[PDB]
């Protein structure tokens with residue numbers, strides 16, 4: 364028996380958690396096993412470990428006439444809310460009030476987080492992934508390549524074009540081959556963010572393809588004429604091979620591949636893990652220096668960083684209607700928001716990945732000096748996963764090197780980060796229109812965006828058809844309710 368036990372009799376519950384297009388919940392995870400030890404509740408995974416589409420797996424699960432005890436994963440907020448109001452997921456308000464002191468105290472001290480997760484009927488249907496920190500992504504460029512080619516740090520988009528063209532054409536890795544790929548990214552969605560260079564938005568928040576507000580008006584980036592004109596330029600950079608030809612396919616290990624083989628010249632990615640490549644490749648590529656770069660002055664004369672940490676993220680977990688132990692489940696959920704539970708969900712397992720030194724969790728040297736970024740290492744053992752948990756920036760600070768720290772400081776100091784969209788409060792019937800049309804519109808927008816970038820569709824020629832399709836798919840019905848909700852609140 365332990366003091367943290369939420370049940371005297373051992374309990375096993377079924378969880379469907381397919382996430383980030385690769386992983387599933389693993390009961391064998393060191394973190395999972397430690398939480399199970401301390402709480403006396405074991406979670407067994409039922410999701411298909413072979414699938415590469417997490418959202419599709421939720422859809423198949425929901426339509427399969429069977430439900431597990433718990434459903435977790437990334438980008439599930441909208442589905443948690445929709446199916447919660449339908450009755451597939453249970454409300455957590457009373458369960459938290461009566462059984463979850465850590466969460467109850469958390470929500471009282473974080474009203475913005477409570478607001479962001481609450482459904483229009485007043486019910487909380489899931490517990491969120493709550494990130495910790497301020498900045499997220501920044502531009503990184505190969506300083507050693509700039510220096511070798513005798514080029515200054517590009518200050519404008521036009522200067523950046525010249526630099527990236529030089530990376531492509533002037534053999535900075537010195538192997539006599541045109542193998543260099545100037546701009547790379549592990550996130551395909553970042554290719555759309557390049558429209559920032561031409562004064563267009565790609566998203567209002569850390570949530571991909573999110574709405575934004577300009578002069579009291581709700582806008583979606585992909586529907587704007589600025590996007591049409593901006594994506595033409597992105598298409599041109601793709602055509603000229605300045606953007607990775609595999610930008611939509613390469614994905615997770617883009618940095619390991621392109622920086623590891625000394626072909627990648629630039630990216631836009633998180634400060635800590637990206638800067639860590641300087642240390643990992645220090646001997647393999649003598650002089651490798653990937654440095655934070657201020658955003659280039661765009662066509663609107665400004666230096667935009669569009670991305671920032673989003674608190675909370677639209678990720679987490681929920682309790683289903685079929686769950687026969689909702690009290691034990693919410694108590695398990697609450698363990699994650701206590702001191703020890705939070706530490707485990709962030710740092711891993713004590714004696715394995717970290718040690719308590721002077722009362723503080725300190726990562727082992729084997730973790731810090733490892734080839735893999737620490738967040739990657741955490742995923743492997745069941746930490747830093749998109750369950751209902753509260754991230755602790757102290758975990759990240761420990762593997763944020765001086766290059767990363769100084770980049771973070773520069774971005775904070777110079778205020779590059781654009782004001783982030785914190786959402787509007789929809790009514791139930793407004794949300795019905797939202798949930799009906801928006802997911803499919805977003806998918807269509809991505810497909811069109813990819814077609815435009817890759818040159819299979821001409822953005823100028825197809826814009827009229829695209830706008831008609833947006834209307835036919837109900838996008839402007841969604842836009843009407845978005846503006847209505849905004850006008851009501853503000």
Ligand SMILES: O=C(O)C1=C[C@H](O)[C@H](O)[C@H](O[C@H]2[C@H](O)[C@H](O)[C@H](O[C@H]3[C@H](O)[C@H](O)[C@H](O)O[C@H]3C(=O)O)O[C@H]2C(=O)O)O1
Pocket residue numbers: 383437494550615633634635636637676738747759
């Ligand atoms: O890389 C970091 O330095 C970093 C620090 C933070 O502590 C945090 O771990 C951050 O993680 C984010 C990063 O994009 C990861 O790759 C991952 O990304 C997934 C997420 O759903 C995201 O929307 C992206 O499009 O794809 C997912 C993926 O795993 O490929 O998690 C992110 C997060 O916000 O937790 O990385």
Ligand SMILES: [Ca+2]
Pocket residue numbers: 534535536537538539540541542543
């Ligand atoms: Ca070369």
